[PDB]
Amino acid sequence: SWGYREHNGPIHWKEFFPIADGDQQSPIEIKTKEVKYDSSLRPLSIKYDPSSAKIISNSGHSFNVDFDDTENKSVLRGGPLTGSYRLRQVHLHWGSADDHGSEHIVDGVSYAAELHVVHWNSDKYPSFVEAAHEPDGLAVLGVFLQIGEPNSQLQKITDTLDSIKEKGKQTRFTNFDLLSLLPPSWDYWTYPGSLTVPPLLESVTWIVLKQPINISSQQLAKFRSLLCTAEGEAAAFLVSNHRPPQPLKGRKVRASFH
Ligand SMILES: COC(=O)c1ccc(SCc2ccccc2)c(S(N)(=O)=O)c1
Ligand SMILES: [Zn+2]
């Protein structure tokens, strides 16, 4: 089964998931001088209720903060999107080294980590699972993290990691102010792409914010202490969980700014 280790890692996913070689795969290299400013794009409009977060868990591939998506208390609107997309989950990608941890790469710069905020089109589809199978079903906001001052807005997360060390562990996680984790500028790039983990579905409108947020090296090192293995299996650590960049295949990357 899939992961980021030598025998089950990204380079081997195309052996098992046909879509891994598809024409709309993510993540990509963003070349900032080659991106097209598009005046038809709209500003992002975000409303994230701190009561929406409920549980944090170790999936074996990252931590996952799950939100109550029963109704439209937390939504993303605007940007390239038609209608309202409902907040479902947040997770993080990193590498074994602080200078090569992100999924998207900007003018050759890989950041220390990348946060993904996953949302689904509830205006058109009745659930996350159904939306995940349609070209306009999902929207993922990407936020880069760069090494710097410790981020006090990550402290709630790092405090829980000891209780979710093994794959499948979960703990209560509520009153989380996700809005305060985002950077002050909501300028972004966008393109059509895919999930960056199996099943690699081509259902994602990517919105990658230009402005990175900070994290300390100590904070980021704590994530690598999560395991990719369950209780009572031989332990292996989740030291890296990012997919390499995929061919653009004629897709247009657009910028909200110039
Ligand atoms: C190591 O990274 C991850 O674990 C991870 C987990 C879930 C999701 S999207 C939710 C999802 C996918 C598949 C099935 C159910 C939910 C993504 S992504 N990078 O495509 O935004 C990445
Ligand atoms: Zn992700």
Q: Tell me, rounded to whole angstroms, the distance of Cα 217 from its chain centroid.
A: 20
The answer to whether the CB of 209 falls within 8 A of the CB of 142 is: yes
Burial code (b: 16+ CB inside 10 Å, e: under 16) for 56-75 equals bbbbbbbbbbbbbbeeeebb
Which one is catalytic: 61, 104, 119, 242? 61
Find the 229 Cα to ligand 2 centroid distance in Å: 19
The ligand that comes nearest to the alpha carbon of residue 228 is 1
Domain limits of the chain?
Answer: 1-258
Question: CA-to-CA distance for 253 and 257, rounded, in angstroms?
Answer: 12
The answer to whether the CB of 130 falls within 8 A of the CB of 53 is: no
**∠ CA(252), CA(256), CA(258), 5° rounding?**
100
Peptide bond into 198 cis (omega under 30): no
- SS3 for 54? strand
Cα separation values, 103 from 68, 92, 165, 182, Å: 27, 10, 23, 18
Question: CA-to-CA distance for 256 and 209, rounded, in angstroms?
Answer: 10
Strands 36-37, 29-30: pairing kind: unpaired
User: In sequence order, what DSSP letters do the residues of 122-139 get, joined into one string?
Assistant: TTT-SSHHHHTTSTTSEE
Q: How many CB atoms lie within 10 A of CB 244?
A: 11
Determine if residue 242 is labeled as part of a ligand binding site: no
Find the 93 Cα to ligand 2 centroid distance in Å: 6
Mutate to test the pocket of ligand 1, among 57, 76, 91, 194 (most ligand atoms within 8 A of CB): 91
Known catalytic residue at 61? yes
Question: CA-to-CA distance for 83 and 245, rounded, in angstroms?
Answer: 29
Find the 194 Cα to ligand 1 centroid distance in Å: 10
Of 20, 28, 19, 22, the C-alpha closest to 190 is 28
**∠ CA(205), CA(209), CA(211), 5° rounding?**
175
Find out if CATH 3.30.450.20 is the number for domain 1-258. no
Q: Is 116 in the pocket of ligand 1 (CB under 6 A)?
A: yes
The answer to whether the CB of 54 falls within 8 A of the CB of 68 is: yes
Structural tokens at position 170 = 């979960």
| 229 φ, ψ (degrees, to nearest 5) | -120, 150
Q: Is 102 in the pocket of ligand 1 (CB under 6 A)?
A: no
